[PDB]
Design a protein around this ligand. Structure first.
Ligand SMILES: [Zn+2]
Ligand SMILES: [Zn+2]
Ligand SMILES: [Zn+2]
Ligand SMILES: [Zn+2]
Length: 337
């Protein structure tokens, strides 16, 4: 038995166990995650959740399965993922979903990309908080996320835990919830309001909440804290980083530095540190550089997982003793808390 302190104090036993699992596991390995693991790939023949490019490359699925709200909120352009999530959970996999919400202020104007999508930079934070004219639009997205979460059940009728990552890459201005679109306080309010709405207004009990700004080039706790929603509102501390295919030594050092920072903060705050999104012509030493850099650092090695969004390189990463794929993780959801 271990005691866990989550954002949702009434979270299900399996959700609590998932958090406890990562707390233990994170100092013994780094789980491999992949966005659209069993629903998109260059080598798969079925998108039913039974195949993955990862499995075809190394003989096992990723341990962490990433999906986003383009599979949950209308119009669900990426299609539903309930069945694929259930298949992944049945294998003992871990599920994470990131919000990719349309712009609440302009979503009825869709036609010419990127109008009305996440990529429509029209500031929409101020007008979507309570009091704002587009608060009902944002609430409609959150209603759909909650209904989906509330009915996401396994074969015994129990809820499937999900690591829900809200308003990522918020320290850049390419999304409507970005740093040119809101003051730090307004962004914190958007995050907090959304968590509160899901947890308290809609009763979601199977979510862990993740925060994930971009990598910082000035790697300080003060910089990460500027738009941080707060320890009462975040369970998972991550970050997103995309680098160059060539001459990337500096970028890899920055990956390690940001992972070390969130790892140290996570230990101080009782959170789970992760690399929420990492990605990039080809670099056939990319994965070897990634795992070697991370595991050599005493803080960065403590991240629970890294999620990616050349075959020999990846096979070496899989063979590394510190990486963990789906069959390498056990007893994730029935740990006593
Ligand atoms: Zn241990
Ligand atoms: Zn997607
Ligand atoms: Zn992200
Ligand atoms: Zn900026």
């Amino acid at each position: 038995p271990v005691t866990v302190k989550l954002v949702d104090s009434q979270a299900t036993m399996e959700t609590r166990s998932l958090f406890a699992f990562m707390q233990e596991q994170r100092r013994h390995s780094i789980m491999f995650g992949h966005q659209h693991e069993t629903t998109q790939g260059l080598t798969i023949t079925r998108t039913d959740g039974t195949q993955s490019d990862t499995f075809n490359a190394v003989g096992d699925f990723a341990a962490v399965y990433g999906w986003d709200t383009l599979s949950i909120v209308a119009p669900k352009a990426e299609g539903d993922i309930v069945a694929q999530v259930k298949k992944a959970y049945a294998r003992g996999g871990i599920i994470t979903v990131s919000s990719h919400f349309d712009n609440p202020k302009t979503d009825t104007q869709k036609g010419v990309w990127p109008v009305g999508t996440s990529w429509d930079q029209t500031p929409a934070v101020v007008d979507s908080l309570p009091g704002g004219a587009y608060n009902p639009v944002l609430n409609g997205y959150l209603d759909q996320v909650a209904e989906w979460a509330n009915n996401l059940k396994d074969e015994q009728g129990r809820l499937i835990p999900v690591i829900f990552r809200l308003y990522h890459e918020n320290t850049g201005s390419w999304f409507w919830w970005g740093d040119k679109q809101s003051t730090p306080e307004q962004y914190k309010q958007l995050f907090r309001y959304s968590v509160e709405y899901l947890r308290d207004v809609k009763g979601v009990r199977n979510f862990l909440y993740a925060y994930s700004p971009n990598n910082f080039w000035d790697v300080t706790e003060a910089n990460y804290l500027e738009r941080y929603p707060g320890d009462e509102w975040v369970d998972v501390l991550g970050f997103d980083t995309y680098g160059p295919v060539a001459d990337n030594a500096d970028w890899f050092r920055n990956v390690v530095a940001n992972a070390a920072l969130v790892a140290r903060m996570a230990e101080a705050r009782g959170k789970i540190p992760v690399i929420s999104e990492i990605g990039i012509l080809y670099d056939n030493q990319w994965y070897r550089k990634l795992i070697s850099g991370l595991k050599a650092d005493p803080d960065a090695r403590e991240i629970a997982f890294l999620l990616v969004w050349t075959l020999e390189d990846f096979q070496a990463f899989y063979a590394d003793e510190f990486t963990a794929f789906n069959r390498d993780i056990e007893q994730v959801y029935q740990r006593p808390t």
